[PDB]
Amino acid sequence: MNFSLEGRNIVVMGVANKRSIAWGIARSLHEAGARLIFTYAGERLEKSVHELAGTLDRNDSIILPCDVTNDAEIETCFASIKEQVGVIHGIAHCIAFANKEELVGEYLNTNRDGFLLAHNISSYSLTAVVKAARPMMTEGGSIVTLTYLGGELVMPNYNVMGVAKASLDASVKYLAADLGKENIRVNSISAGPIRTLSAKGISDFNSILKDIEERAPLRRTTTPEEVGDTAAFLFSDMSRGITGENLHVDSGFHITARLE
Amino acid sequence: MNFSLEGRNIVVMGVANKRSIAWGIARSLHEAGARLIFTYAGERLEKSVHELAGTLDRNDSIILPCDVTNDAEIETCFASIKEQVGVIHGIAHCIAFANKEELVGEYLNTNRDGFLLAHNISSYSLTAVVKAARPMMTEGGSIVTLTYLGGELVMPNYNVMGVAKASLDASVKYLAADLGKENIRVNSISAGPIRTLSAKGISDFNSILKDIEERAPLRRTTTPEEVGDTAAFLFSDMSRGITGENLHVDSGFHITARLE
Amino acid sequence: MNFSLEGRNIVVMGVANKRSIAWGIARSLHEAGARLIFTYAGERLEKSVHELAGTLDRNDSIILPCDVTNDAEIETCFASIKEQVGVIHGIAHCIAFANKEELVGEYLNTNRDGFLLAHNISSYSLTAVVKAARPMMTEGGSIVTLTYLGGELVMPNYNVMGVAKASLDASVKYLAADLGKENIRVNSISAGPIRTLSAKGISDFNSILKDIEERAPLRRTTTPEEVGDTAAFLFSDMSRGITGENLHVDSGFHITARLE
Amino acid sequence: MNFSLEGRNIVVMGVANKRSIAWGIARSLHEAGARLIFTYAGERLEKSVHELAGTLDRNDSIILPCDVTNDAEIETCFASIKEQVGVIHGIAHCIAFANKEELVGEYLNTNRDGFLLAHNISSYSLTAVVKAARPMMTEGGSIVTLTYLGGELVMPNYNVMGVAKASLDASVKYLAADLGKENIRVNSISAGPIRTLSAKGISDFNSILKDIEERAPLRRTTTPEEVGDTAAFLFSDMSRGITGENLHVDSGFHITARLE
């Protein structure tokens, strides 16, 4: 086996701009040879994502809308993919949302509507996309989602997104147990903090990143390319023994408890 | 400090019949001296629960309806409790629901509505009850919920309830981090399987229980009284250093991987 | 069942002075009614421990030497216990040692001799004491050891003691799986930091304790009495469904990743 | 970055025959371009390992004795490596031993000598080899050891090897925290069961493997090549954000609790 993704069609869900973790993943996968299908939420991202995809050195990308709020766009999107490419070999699920005011101060700033919205977008959407993709994954495949340490432990302010990530992380395991008999693997990458659009609203994020640079074993914060290169492994056949796993790409921060 | 719960008002949520784990908890807490407030869902359980409470040797129990589907009954119920007793010292949250057809065969038998219903009842309700109880917990307190190993690992058929338990387990941690500054602890008991009303629908449950008897370190399945006696510790001052914890009351089954 | 330890003979291993965690455990167990057998290492501790035991309100304690370096004293000690009391119902194992210069700076300051000494005293000794006690635990029983979060994650300077605690924690599980068929439970308490004789040599320990007071959910550092009161639960019949478990008595610190 | 190991000198410790997991790793690393240094224990393995290395398509391998019992051979071996190649970029540590009679029946079949031997060979040796290699790892590097699920949970008969693996797993974390500031990563692969020389003595191993084929998500047992291909990722720059991690290459078995 080898690391090449030539002849693999991979859906990358969640590019918003060039700082998106999904854009780090798309670059790594394209460099490995994959043909990419980008999905975006919101008509104003369409041109953005088309332009970023156009910087890739092959012009073979497909770009499609897919809001994951309910099933309707999911069905439209995956029908297009089925007609255009026939078979899907992977999905990178890079989607999260919660109401921003719930991600400041106490976790108890959430409420039922917000809690269920965060779980719908951040956790159920993986299952919804799996459901729509499964019958087109006829040649085996690999599904990767992104999680964060605040789904395992309390991270200040992460709040209802931590609870939704814990739901996502459990779903990765149950999906992996349903799909491995069809040679479909399901894993996550637990990325360290990265200054993306989804970092806007964190207080004193510069202090968080500085502390990671001091406390993490490798003495540096995570990049989208580190995350991308681990995702290229997970979509390749090199990782075929691995499913239901959560790989921390966080400079080792997960093994530490405090800064000396 | 001591194990007594004399002078503690504890709300026990989720008695349905004498096999309920919540009924094991209520017995242990009453024996330790607590005054109990029982809550029930559905008008047909009212007389049931009143009768079971009437078997306790003090006639000081309060029995109130509290469906946790939205906030409305929660607010009514906790207002009654505030007027009747003034201060709450504990809550035992023993509530779960998912659509039964999602808890057979593949996890992918769920759907958005079912997934969000399971999360609403089985996970958000703890937060909803916490929110309504917090201003009446003026003397410090202890909150205990019930979880199951299928929120940590794949258990056949547990499916969307495992994902909802993983959300519940994360919420226990974030609640504990919000409330410890008010001397309120939040913990779970991860009970081994018990033949309750919520076991109806498990296939070959007799085989599951027999396997636990063979594989568990202590060679026996869990009882509601084992769970109750651990919950009496968690509501007592003896456990005041413990919060955010998940105590397995499962005969040791959690430490095993297979039956020799 | 009840919390009483009347009629239970419990061996408490590792009192050195009144700050020892084992002394917090002995107090709680004596208050619950247990008859205690204290063991000490080193002839200079004999009078110390006799005097502390003499402050207990019943004068029924036995005090015996037991260095755990090899098996010889273990055998002498447990033979005395067998003749004096007949049956052992519990052991509190509160023993650790590593060379102090290995617990400063890098973990790589250890060496083979030091590593194996730390493992012998801090981890194998539990197995050695279990082996000598097992045939006198004819009425069921409960064994509790003390561990620390640095066996689960990196804690600065904890170094080879963290590795030895990880060995101890695994041994708790395998012991629990061997002994549950004889109604003997084996658990640990993972205590938060306490200023004991085994804290001498930690740098800036005042800063560590202050940070725990800020970061821990309950906003306070651990006491020996908190640890003692959880150990009284673990030796009582109230905890009979629990074995192979690690209970954190740390003010909730284990669920946090950083100080906001 | 890329997956190539051209220009990387990697020490592979623990080939015994063509079924060794280390031989799966060496093949994958050689295919990725690494120059390999094989180490073996026992003069009778010398010719074995030389012959297997001679099947590789470049004849650039070095083969050296390295018994890890004490430091002496380690020092000889690493001195040879330093003179022959100058810089080490990786180590694959594939070494374990315990007395076989301790790995049948109860864990309590161990004893002090056996316990400390298992820990010395199976856990401290990683630290000993790290210590000797560190000053030759001047260009950054990656260290991979092999662990097994029985270091996380009880696996029947794994016994003192499970305790020694738990010590190894903790050492991986503390090593990673010491060495990341020198751009050296330290990780493990937790392989599923493989019929190697170290499987001789397992009872009913055919039943264990059949059960894995039924219970594991991917419905198949692990191969040395699956393990090798994950180790090629860990030694490559693609995995540079990952340290202190334990990657399960076990067909997903780690996420399951029982066979339906």
Ligand SMILES: NC(=O)c1ccc[n+]([C@@H]2O[C@H](COP(=O)([O-])OP(=O)(O)OC[C@H]3O[C@@H](n4cnc5c(N)ncnc54)[C@H](O)[C@@H]3O)[C@@H](O)[C@H]2O)c1
């Ligand atoms: N930035 C971090 O520090 C970090 C660390 C670990 C994990 N993560 C996770 O990485 C993933 C990607 O986030 P990011 O940091 O790259 O930020 P981002 O804002 O670039 O990406 C989040 C994506 O989610 C999409 N999304 C939100 N609601 C959607 C909906 N209704 N339908 C479809 N798409 C929707 C957004 O359009 C956006 O493209 C998220 O799951 C996030 O939780 C982020």
Ligand SMILES: NC(=O)c1ccc[n+]([C@@H]2O[C@H](COP(=O)([O-])OP(=O)(O)OC[C@H]3O[C@@H](n4cnc5c(N)ncnc54)[C@H](O)[C@@H]3O)[C@@H](O)[C@H]2O)c1
């Ligand atoms: N039985 C087991 O094997 C087991 C093992 C571990 C944990 N648990 C958990 O224990 C808890 C109690 O379940 P049980 O096994 O005693 O069964 P049970 O059926 O007796 O109790 C479940 C309770 O949930 C209540 N509930 C359901 N929907 C509700 C709603 N909308 N509003 C308010 N209450 C609602 C029911 O009325 C019932 O009283 C649950 O959280 C369950 O997940 C059960």
Ligand SMILES: NC(=O)c1ccc[n+]([C@@H]2O[C@H](COP(=O)([O-])OP(=O)(O)OC[C@H]3O[C@@H](n4cnc5c(N)ncnc54)[C@H](O)[C@@H]3O)[C@@H](O)[C@H]2O)c1
């Ligand atoms: N102090 C903490 O912050 C803390 C936190 C968690 C766990 N622990 C653990 O609690 C336990 C008790 O330590 P402590 O903090 O009370 O300190 P302590 O120094 O009072 O107790 C340690 C005990 O170990 C005994 N011991 C050392 N070598 C021995 C040998 N060869 N034979 C027999 N006994 C031997 C000492 O005599 C002493 O009584 C230890 O396992 C320690 O790792 C301590």
Ligand SMILES: NC(=O)c1ccc[n+]([C@@H]2O[C@H](COP(=O)([O-])OP(=O)(O)OC[C@H]3O[C@@H](n4cnc5c(N)ncnc54)[C@H](O)[C@@H]3O)[C@@H](O)[C@H]2O)c1
């Ligand atoms: N086979 C499995 O099912 C399995 C599963 C997970 C992990 N592991 C681990 O994989 C590693 C490799 O074992 P394997 O299964 O390939 O079997 P193996 O017997 O082929 O390899 C074990 C190696 O350890 C070496 N070793 C033993 N004592 C030594 C000493 N004193 N000095 C130097 N080398 C010494 C042996 O010479 C042998 O080369 C071990 O750490 C084992 O625990 C094995």
Ligand SMILES: Cc1c(CN(C)C(=O)/C=C/c2cnc3c(c2)CCC(=O)N3)c2ccccc2n1C
């Ligand atoms: C690293 C990190 C993140 C980023 N992250 C891991 C996320 O999963 C972000 C999710 C997110 C989810 N929903 C959001 C936003 C961010 C901001 C914009 C918005 O409106 N809603 C984060 C987000 C909130 C609080 C703390 C946080 N930390 C410490």
Ligand SMILES: Cc1c(CN(C)C(=O)/C=C/c2cnc3c(c2)CCC(=O)N3)c2ccccc2n1C
């Ligand atoms: C022990 C166990 C349970 C019971 N349990 C732990 C639960 O949390 C049950 C939750 C539940 C949740 N919702 C349910 C029902 C049960 C049945 C009645 C119904 O209509 N909906 C369980 C439930 C489903 C599948 C497997 C299961 N196992 C192995």
Ligand SMILES: Cc1c(CN(C)C(=O)/C=C/c2cnc3c(c2)CCC(=O)N3)c2ccccc2n1C
């Ligand atoms: C809380 C804590 C402790 C204390 N502890 C948990 C221990 O297990 C101590 C073990 C110990 C073990 N061996 C030791 C000594 C202490 C000091 C005296 C000596 O000579 N050898 C500790 C010990 C060393 C480094 C950091 C530490 N932290 C953060």
Ligand SMILES: Cc1c(CN(C)C(=O)/C=C/c2cnc3c(c2)CCC(=O)N3)c2ccccc2n1C
């Ligand atoms: C998969 C597996 C293994 C193999 N393994 C993971 C190991 O780490 C083996 C270690 C080992 C360690 N020491 C050993 C031997 C094997 C056999 C030859 C000998 O003399 N001593 C194993 C080993 C013993 C018991 C159960 C076991 N299971 C279920």
